[PDB]
């Protein structure tokens, strides 16, 4: 046989909440701001 081997690793931060890939890590962190919400008023 000797087919070979698999397994690669390429730096890439992507939001696993919506589905958006970014270049840096600070760009994604500033995006999760819209994801997180707050609780208080019932009506909402």
Q: 15 pairs with which residues across the strands?
A: 20
**Contact indicator for 21, 10 with CB cutoff of 8 Å:** no
Q: How far is the CB of 44 from Zn ion (least distance, A)?
A: 21
Which chain residues interact with Zn ion by CB under 5 A? 15, 17-18
Q: How far is the CB of 8 from Zn ion (least distance, A)?
A: 24
Nearer to Zn ion, 28 or 40 (CB): 28
**Contact indicator for 21, 4 with CB cutoff of 8 Å:** no
Look-up: residue for tokens 């696993």? Answer: 16
Nearer to Zn ion, 3 or 21 (CB): 21
């Amino acid at each position: 046989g000797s087919s070979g081997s698999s397994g690669t690793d390429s730096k890439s931060y992507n939001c696993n909440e919506c589905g958006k890939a970014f270049t840096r890590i600070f760009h994604l962190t500033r995006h999760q701001k819209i994801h997180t919400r707050k609780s208080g008023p019932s009506s909402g």
